[PDB]
Design an enzyme around this catalytic site. Sequence first.
Site, mmCIF file in Angstrom:
data_model
loop_
_atom_site.group_PDB
_atom_site.id
_atom_site.type_symbol
_atom_site.label_atom_id
_atom_site.label_comp_id
_atom_site.label_asym_id
_atom_site.label_seq_id
_atom_site.Cartn_x
_atom_site.Cartn_y
_atom_site.Cartn_z
ATOM 1 N N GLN A 17 -0.747 69.983 -31.291
ATOM 2 C CA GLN A 17 -1.680 69.308 -30.385
ATOM 3 C C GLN A 17 -2.790 68.578 -31.156
ATOM 4 O OE1 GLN A 17 -3.136 72.525 -27.834
ATOM 5 N NE2 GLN A 17 -1.470 72.174 -26.378
ATOM 6 N N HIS A 33 -4.551 74.429 -29.366
ATOM 7 C CA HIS A 33 -5.875 74.810 -28.848
ATOM 8 C C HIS A 33 -7.057 74.458 -29.742
ATOM 9 C CE1 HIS A 33 -3.887 77.931 -25.887
ATOM 10 N NE2 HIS A 33 -3.290 76.750 -25.875
ATOM 11 N N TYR A 45 -17.375 82.528 -19.772
ATOM 12 C CA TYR A 45 -16.412 82.008 -18.784
ATOM 13 C C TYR A 45 -15.115 82.818 -18.718
ATOM 14 C CZ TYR A 45 -20.121 79.193 -17.580
ATOM 15 O OH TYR A 45 -21.382 78.855 -17.142
ATOM 16 N N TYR A 101 3.318 83.289 -20.009
ATOM 17 C CA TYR A 101 4.477 82.432 -19.733
ATOM 18 C C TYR A 101 5.715 83.210 -19.286
ATOM 19 C CZ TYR A 101 1.493 78.963 -21.933
ATOM 20 O OH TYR A 101 0.442 78.122 -22.236
#
EC number: 1.1.5.-
Length: 348
Positions: free
Chosen positions: A60, A125, A228, A239
């Site tokens: 990513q 990430h 959070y 998954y």
Amino acid sequence: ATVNVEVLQDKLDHPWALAFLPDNHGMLITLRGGELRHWQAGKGLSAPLSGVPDVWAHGQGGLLDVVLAPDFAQSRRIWLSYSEVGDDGKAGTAVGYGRLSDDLSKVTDFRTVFRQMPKLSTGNHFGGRLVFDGKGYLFIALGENNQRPTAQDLDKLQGKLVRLTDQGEIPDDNPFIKESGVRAEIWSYGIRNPQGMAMNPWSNALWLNEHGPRGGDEINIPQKGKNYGWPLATWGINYSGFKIPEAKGEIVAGTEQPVFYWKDSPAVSGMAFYNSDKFPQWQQKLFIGALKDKDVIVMSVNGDKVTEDGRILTDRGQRIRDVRTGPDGYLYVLTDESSGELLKVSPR
Ligand SMILES: [Ca+2]
């Protein structure tokens, strides 16, 4: 079906972000493989600019955000984020700035001023979004590098929203500046992989979004020093279909809830609030890219609340990477494809 779409530029190899240049000088676009390019109407797409940092273009990662400094009109300063490898082959997000030349051919004296440490990513990430709040500060979105528990660790820059001054310094009023062991750069923690972020123009407050695992994408309104929840609290599952092992539940004391979540993840991406009279039907809306659903989510913004109106661009079948509201009151969209596009979008 519901919107007009003009393809401004095609054949873009995984564009990640765009920045509008002032005085109708077009825009800069990052291509994740490591190129920064200039696009302008009638000129098309430039060769890569020189002076751009080398990046770790794996998974990513790569060249991520491009954002103009608030004082660009005088400084011509532009900020970039990217993934950078460490000493064991693992990587982390890095953030720096340089000066954009008058002729738009180069970035000069680029310097890296902030690094996610430790570097724990093998490809996933990074986060990467940079947002200036317009009142002295820079917010930096950091993923947890796919090491779930680290998002809770205040000694680590994984799964953190960072706040620096607009010069990249540590603010003297950051929440953990006096907390032993903690990284002073931290504003909020307990985030998984933040993607889109933007200043809400009606509340003058930062909003962010993040990818959940199997489900559980979120919009948060992050506050100073707050948790959070990730991975102690999640609206998603692993998954496999089984719970995230660290998770205690969906709602967990001591942690803050999102203002919106999706149990079926769109894989939310770049976000833009719409506050222009150009297209009054789009006033008080928030547009969010969806990588997995391959469209844009149209949402009604209602103070600190948000609801989903529906989807646009679904018929084009393209993964959506970034969404921005232009100074002209049009929506600008980047697709997450090998043969990606810059789109100019308006309602019918
Ligand atoms: Ca959360």
